[PDB]
């Protein structure tokens, strides 16, 4: 399918489809107002990433452990049983938290990696 | 076990307001700065997706009516504004012999007005309708706009043919199409698709009759904000249309004079053949089962006990209490009092119709524009495809209302939603990143 | 309900090729890792190779790495592995396995969940 | 030189001014429009190379292999006797294929490598 | 501390709030302009980290040695007793300089890096 | 006291207090508003 | 001190009829001629 064509689909299933909602993120003066507008929040995503430690990639993995507060349920329930919808809903009290120990964790892999790198 | 894993490209989305972009297939709705519409746009079904909508909170009416006033003022801004037509007139009746119901409604009105040159002056003589001319007290009189503020005319080359106008979103949201039949505004849709913009909207403009828009998928579909607060509109779409035949018998002649350098004023001229009444021819048998459909859907809302009775707009001003529509570049007032006049209890119809020629749309006070004549007959044919009703105890009473503007163009937006793209989350995944 | 069937050759000489293919029924083949385990005649089991349920990613014992390749398709519901050279010491009963490996999505595994009846291949 | 001084020059030599170029990429509506979609052009083409898996990246291999149906000319013949204008105009007919697999590419690469990172 | 609460404190001290800033740096017509050029700044920012070889790094080592020309001070002297607006005075004379070399650094590794990836 | 130069007597002296001096205003008188219409749209007000 | 990048081994075929740039230029010395004149004096009563 194409644009959005996995939403209704598994959390699972959907992940093969992540390239084509990214392609449709970025494709008179309050038009142009809104061009702007999305071409800041385009780069305000884009900055979120790079801080993480993730860059140009669509699928990140980090060493923040899940709380197991933030939602119980078990892995195969969240991956074949679920939407992002439902997923995002189920999650959102707790986006600023997990956000903010993805940044740190960066910044602590980035001294490490500088320390180590500084070993003759 | 599980840590966290950042996922970018998901397709989640939340309710958003934007800003629109055009897209389309002389006229005063075609727009220069706005772009060519998709030959061949898409569509992508949604399976499993259950999307709430609420046509009452739908921002595109909105949008669609600043842009609606925006396109109308900015085309009709550079051409001739008639400050000098506010004179003191002496008028008298186009035809006193006349015993037709068009009797004393033409007026033959004679006025000074202006010339090229700032020192010379000229006698006009015109034909005015009663409508547009208010006594001041072979009488004296004065254009109704004199009390309210100066008249702009409308360019004579300016169309005002809608144009169907598509509706398409900006990069990083989309347009959910309910696709449900038989929705009624509110609450969710199980045939949810997303497009990139909306099929055309004909910016047509009436009043208490909708007119060349889209049909009910199966029956009639009566839409209401709140059915039992009597202030809310109701909205009536049809699964069948009704045709409706509106004529201008009167090969009427259009004369001009020039008002300055650069200015020139149209005015209607003689009438050629007999005066005629405008009107609108409307079969009565296909009107009756149209309307007795309505009352069957309302019953549905209201009992199988109940009687529902139709009446005639209450008093107020011409713009509100009949219908009004744009006609060949004529604007008609009608009537309707044939129309909804009836008790319902568990071969044609001609309507009236005056023509007057100094406009106030859109509820405004102090934008007056004058319409030129139209030389010769007009005819238009039109396909009624939903009502306006308001509601005023074992009989219900409604009458046409309407008047609100965006009621229209709600009537067409309610099937869309414009939703905002965050295509940025996280879930728990049994995948750790390597460490130092 | 769930089988595995081992189809292959019979006895090979050294500095030949033998390809062993398992054929799967009663369960989606694409959503499990599959492997090879083999069994001298007088010991008991070793690991010889690990392929992911999608096939593109896989992994090999080093005693064979340069001679056996690991291959899948989903579509024919088929494991293959295809071995070269066959040494004295690979004479075995080869078994193909589900289990041992879960694409992240999944809930872990690191262990062999079903078995086929095995194949003996002499050299 | 400068600013498509290579332009001339064989796709060896041109390939060692690659920064030249990208750094004058990025260098009264009307005009902020033009601005405008300046940035929304520069974006989409740092997205396409972010889905590619190149990001931050002038010179990027990747796994596709060479038709051979696209182009049938010998290495050293390309790289040593044509301009990039030249080859532009060869090979404008499979841009969208070679576009294509390259997005194909990465997806295998990226679940590849989370299945990779899974393992205990 | 927020943004900028860093400014008068060490440079050592000071490298733990590099997100801090960072984040602060994206956050009528001409109102309109000033966003636009906004968006051009930061855009000309990462386009010359992403030149260099660094992209999306907030701390990012290189293969440029220091000359001791551009500055002789001793390492802790400038870490511990000296703050960023000191030090971006101090070596302004030369931020040309060091650009440019980091620039050849890093297209001199990009073609090693592709000649070892042609090896067989 | 703030100024640009104060050397300067060209220069403005801007002199910032550090307490507030009330100052009470009054127009005392009783004054009509009448107003005209001077064309469609159009009127004006004047004293009365 | 304006850039000039004499481009080596290049043939780029012009076709100056079909030049967007005379539009552009066009456009622009229309523009400005009627912003530079609009605020001015409209001899109205000369018209006599
Ligand atoms: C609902 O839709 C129907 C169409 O399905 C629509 O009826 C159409 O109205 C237009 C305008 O009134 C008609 O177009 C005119 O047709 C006559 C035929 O004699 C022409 O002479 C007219 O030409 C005049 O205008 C031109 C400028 O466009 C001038 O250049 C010319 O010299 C004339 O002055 C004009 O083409 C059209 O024919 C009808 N269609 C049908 C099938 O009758 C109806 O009006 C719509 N309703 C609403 C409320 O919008
Ligand atoms: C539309 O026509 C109806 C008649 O069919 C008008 O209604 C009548 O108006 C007169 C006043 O002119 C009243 O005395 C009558 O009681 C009304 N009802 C009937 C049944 O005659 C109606 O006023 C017309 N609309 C307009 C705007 O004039
Ligand atoms: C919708 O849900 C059904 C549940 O049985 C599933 O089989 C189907 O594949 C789903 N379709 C989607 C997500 O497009
Ligand atoms: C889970 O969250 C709570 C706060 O809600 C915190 O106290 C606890 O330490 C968290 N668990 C882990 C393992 O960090
Ligand atoms: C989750 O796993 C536990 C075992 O740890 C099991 O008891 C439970 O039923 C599982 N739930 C689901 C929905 O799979
Ligand atoms: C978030 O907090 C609000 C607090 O009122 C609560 O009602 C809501 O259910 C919470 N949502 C989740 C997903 O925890
Ligand atoms: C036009 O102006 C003349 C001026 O002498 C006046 O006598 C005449 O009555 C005016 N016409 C009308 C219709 O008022
Ligand atoms: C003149 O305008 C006022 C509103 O400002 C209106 O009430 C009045 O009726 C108008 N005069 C006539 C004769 O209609
Ligand atoms: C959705 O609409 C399509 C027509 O485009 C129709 O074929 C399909 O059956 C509809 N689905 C539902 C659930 O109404
Ligand atoms: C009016 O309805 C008929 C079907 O009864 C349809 O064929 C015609 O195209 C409609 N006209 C308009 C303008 O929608
Ligand atoms: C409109 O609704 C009536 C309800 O009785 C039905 O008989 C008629 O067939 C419907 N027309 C269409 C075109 O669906
Ligand atoms: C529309 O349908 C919903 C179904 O949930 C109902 O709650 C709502 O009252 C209906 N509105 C009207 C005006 O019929
Ligand atoms: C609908 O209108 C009635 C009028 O009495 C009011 O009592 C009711 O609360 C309204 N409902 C909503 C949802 O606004
Ligand atoms: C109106 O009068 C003109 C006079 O030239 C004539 O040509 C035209 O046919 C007339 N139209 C009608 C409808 O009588
Ligand atoms: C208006 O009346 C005058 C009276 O002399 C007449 O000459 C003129 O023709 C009349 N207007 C029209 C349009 O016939
Ligand atoms: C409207 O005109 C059409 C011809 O175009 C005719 O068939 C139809 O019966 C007319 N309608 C009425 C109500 O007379
Ligand atoms: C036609 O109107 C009459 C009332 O005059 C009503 O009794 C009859 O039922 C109507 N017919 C239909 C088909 O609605
Ligand atoms: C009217 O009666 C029908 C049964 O013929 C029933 O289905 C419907 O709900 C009733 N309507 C009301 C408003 O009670
Ligand atoms: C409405 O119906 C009545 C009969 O009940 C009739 O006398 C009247 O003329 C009809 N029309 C109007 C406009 O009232
Ligand atoms: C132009 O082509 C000639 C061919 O002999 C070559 O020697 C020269 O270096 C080229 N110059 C460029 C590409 O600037
Ligand atoms: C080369 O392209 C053709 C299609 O033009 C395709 O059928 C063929 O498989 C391609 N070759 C390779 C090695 O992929
Ligand atoms: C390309 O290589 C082949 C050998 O594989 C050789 O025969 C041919 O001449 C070469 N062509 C060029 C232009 O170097
Ligand atoms: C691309 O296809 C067109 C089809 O008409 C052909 O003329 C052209 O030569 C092709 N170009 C290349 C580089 O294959
Ligand atoms: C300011 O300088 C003093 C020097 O003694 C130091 O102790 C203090 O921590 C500094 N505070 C800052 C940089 O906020
Ligand atoms: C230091 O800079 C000078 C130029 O100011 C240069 O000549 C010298 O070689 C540089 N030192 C090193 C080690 O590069
Ligand atoms: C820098 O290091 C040298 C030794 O190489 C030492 O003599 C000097 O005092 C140091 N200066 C500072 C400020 O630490
Ligand atoms: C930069 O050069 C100027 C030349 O006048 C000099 O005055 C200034 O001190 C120099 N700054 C540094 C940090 O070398
Ligand atoms: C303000 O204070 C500074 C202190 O350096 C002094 O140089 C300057 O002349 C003063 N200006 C005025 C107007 O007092
Ligand atoms: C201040 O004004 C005096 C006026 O004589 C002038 O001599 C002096 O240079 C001025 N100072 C500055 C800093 O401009
Ligand atoms: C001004 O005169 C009005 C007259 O109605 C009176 O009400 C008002 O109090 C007077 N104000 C003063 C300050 O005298």
Known sequence: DGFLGAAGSTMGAASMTLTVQARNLLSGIKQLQARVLAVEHYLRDQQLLGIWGCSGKLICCTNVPWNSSWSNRNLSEIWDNMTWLQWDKEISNYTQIIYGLLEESQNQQEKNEQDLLALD | ?436 | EVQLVETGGGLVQPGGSLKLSCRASGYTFSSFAMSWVRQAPGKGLEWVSLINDRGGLTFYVDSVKGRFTISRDNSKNTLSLQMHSLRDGDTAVYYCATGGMSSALQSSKYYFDFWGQGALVTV
Chains 1, 4, 5 share one sequence.
């Open chain 2, 1 to 436: 076990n599980l840590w966290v894993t950042v996922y970018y490209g998901v397709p989640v989305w939340k309710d958003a307001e934007t800003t629109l972009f055009c897209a389309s297939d002389h006229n005063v709705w075609a727009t220069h700065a706005c772009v060519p519409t998709d030959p061949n746009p898409q569509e992508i079904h949604l399976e499993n997706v259950t999307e709430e909508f609420n046509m009452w909170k739908n921002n595109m009416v909105e949008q669609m009516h600043e842009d609606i006033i925006s396109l109308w003022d900015q085309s009709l801004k550079p051409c001739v504004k008639l400050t000098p037509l506010c004179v003191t007139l002496q008028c008298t009746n186009y035809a006193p012999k006349l015993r037709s119901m068009m009797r004393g409604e033409i007026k033959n009105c004679s006025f000074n007005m202006t010339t090229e040159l700032r020192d010379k002056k000229q006698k006009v003589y015109s034909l005015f309708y009663r409508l547009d001319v208010v006594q001041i007290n072979n009488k004296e009189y004065r254009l109704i706009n004199c009390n309210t503020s100066a008249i702009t005319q409308a360019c004579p080359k300016v169309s005002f043919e809608p144009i169907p106008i598509h509706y398409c979103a900006p990069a990083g949201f989309a347009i959910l199409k309910c696709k449900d039949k038989k929705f009624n505004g509110t609450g969710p849709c199980q045939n949810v698709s997303t497009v990139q913009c909306t099929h055309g909207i004909k910016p047509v403009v009436s009043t208490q009759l909708l007119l060349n828009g889209s049909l009910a998928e199966e029956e009639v579909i009566i839409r209401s904000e709140n059915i039992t607060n009597n202030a809310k509109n109701i909205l009536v779409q049809l699964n069948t249309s009704v045709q409706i035949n509106c004529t201008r018998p009167s090969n009427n002649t259009v004369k001009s004079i020039r008002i300055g350098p650069g200015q020139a004023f149209y005015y209607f001229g003689d009438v050629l053949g007999h005066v005629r009444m405008a009107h609108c021819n409307i079969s009565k048998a296909t009107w009756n089962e149209t309307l007795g459909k309505v009352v069957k859907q309302l019953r549905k809302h209201f009992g199988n006990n109940t009687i529902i009775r139709f009446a005639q707009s209450s008093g107020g001003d011409l713009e509100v209490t009949t219908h009004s529509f744009n006609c060949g570049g004529e604007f008609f007032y009608c009537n309707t009092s044939g129309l909804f006049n009836s008790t319902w209890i568990s071969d044609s119809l001609i309507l009236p119709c005056w023509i007057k020629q100094i406009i106030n749309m859109w509820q405004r006070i102090g934008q007056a524009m004058y319409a030129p004549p139209i030389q010769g007959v007009i005819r238009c044919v039109s396909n009624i495809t939903g009502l306006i009703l308001t509601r005023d105890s074992t009989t219900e009473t409604f009458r046409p209302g309407g008047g609100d503007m965006r009621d229209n163009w709600r009537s067409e937006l309610y099937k869309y939603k414009v939703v905002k793209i965050e295509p940025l989350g996280v879930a728990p995944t049994r995948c750790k990143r390597r460490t130092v």
